[PDB]
Amino acid sequence: GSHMLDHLLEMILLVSEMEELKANPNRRAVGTVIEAKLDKGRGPVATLLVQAGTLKVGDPIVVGTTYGRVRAMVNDSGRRVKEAGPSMPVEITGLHDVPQAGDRFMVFEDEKKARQIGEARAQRQ
């Protein structure tokens, strides 16, 4: 989005997703994983480029054909965070299955709640 002013934007899990961000031809809201492997301590980790929207901890993420929930978020700079924005490489965890590099993952709620509240574009009346 346009920056997204930090206060408290409720977003946790998705609701009813039929939205098109339009980014990849595979699904109109996905991204590609750059490297993915298991870590004997951190768990199955997947360094990816979030393209579907915004990647946050707690997201139910679908990587390839397996879904999981983002346990920890480590970004491009190597910092653990809570929420990362689009176009930024981040490494997720909590797939509990084998993630693959070059695969495609789907993560999007993003405007869902903002729009729900009436913050983003929907239709205020």
From Swiss-Prot:
Subcellular locations according to the entry: Cytoplasm
Superkingdom of origin: Bacteria
Protein task: One of the essential components for the initiation of protein synthesis. Protects formylmethionyl-tRNA from spontaneous hydrolysis and promotes its binding to the 30S ribosomal subunits. Also involved in the hydrolysis of GTP during the formation of the 70S ribosomal complex.
Family per similarity comment: Belongs to the TRAFAC class translation factor GTPase superfamily. Classic translation factor GTPase family. IF-2 subfamily.
Name of the featured protein: Translation initiation factor IF-2
Naturally occurring in which organism (per UniProt): Geobacillus stearothermophilus (Bacillus stearothermophilus)
Lineage, broadest ranks: Bacteria, Bacillati, Bacillota, Bacilli, Bacillales
